[PDB]
């Protein structure tokens, strides 16, 4: 399964575009997508709707680094063979994120 086949993989969308999709008040907390990183060439960003105690609705952006040796991580101690495995893991428990992944971003 290539990442391009996954409903949560948005590719080369901007950070601004990810926020426009995810700040929808209809979206459950933990609505998410994965995009190419605009900051680190070859990395990915996990963008996730959130509700903060002081700031209210917001989008969290987590940098997914790529090891040249193979594999992906948001934290160095927690490595995955694929972005699909990373998504599945953070869908079960936050483990470091503000909130677990709950909902694949609508296409808006």
């Amino acid at each position: 399964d290539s990442i391009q086949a996954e409903e949560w993989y948005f590719g080369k969308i901007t950070r601004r575009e990810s926020e426009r999709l995810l700040l929808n008040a209809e979206n459950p907390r933990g609505t998410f997508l994965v995009r190419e990183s605009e900051t680190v060439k070859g990395a990915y960003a996990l963008s996730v709707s959130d509700f903060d105690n002081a700031k209210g609705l917001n989008v969290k952006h987590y940098l997914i680094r790529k090891l040249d040796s193979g594999g992906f991580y948001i934290t160095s101690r927690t490595q995955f063979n694929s972005l699909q495995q990373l998504v599945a893991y953070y869908s079960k428990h936050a483990d470091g994120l503000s909130h677990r992944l709950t909902t694949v971003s609508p296409t808006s």
Side-chain angles (χ1 to χ4, degrees), residues 1-15 17-40 42-54 56-65 67-91 93-108:
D1 271 61
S2 70
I3 62 181
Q4 291 83 14
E6 298 291 353
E7 300 191 58
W8 41 259
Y9 182 74
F10 282 60
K12 300 171 300 292
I13 65 158
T14 61
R15 174 187 175 116
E17 177 58 2
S18 80
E19 297 198 348
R20 190 194 63 76
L21 293 174
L22 296 173
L23 284 173
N24 187 337
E26 282 186 36
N27 288 331
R29 189 165 184 198
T31 299
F32 76 95
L33 60 82
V34 176
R35 61 184 172 78
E36 291 191 2
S37 178
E38 81 286 10
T39 61
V40 176
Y44 297 87
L46 175 61
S47 297
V48 190
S49 77
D50 192 58
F51 195 87
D52 187 74
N53 288 0
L57 286 174
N58 71 102
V59 179
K60 290 290 186 264
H61 304 280
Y62 306 106
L63 190 74
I64 303 167
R65 290 179 192 277
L67 298 161
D68 301 78
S69 39
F72 302 91
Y73 76 85
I74 293 167
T75 329
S76 36
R77 41 176 185 87
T78 314
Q79 295 190 10
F80 306 96
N81 306 321
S82 69
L83 287 179
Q84 292 93 331
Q85 193 178 68
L86 183 151
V87 165
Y89 178 93
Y90 289 109
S91 83
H93 310 106
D95 191 23
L97 308 186
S98 288
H99 196 280
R100 81 184 182 90
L101 310 181
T102 66
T103 315
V104 171
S105 182
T107 36
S108 329

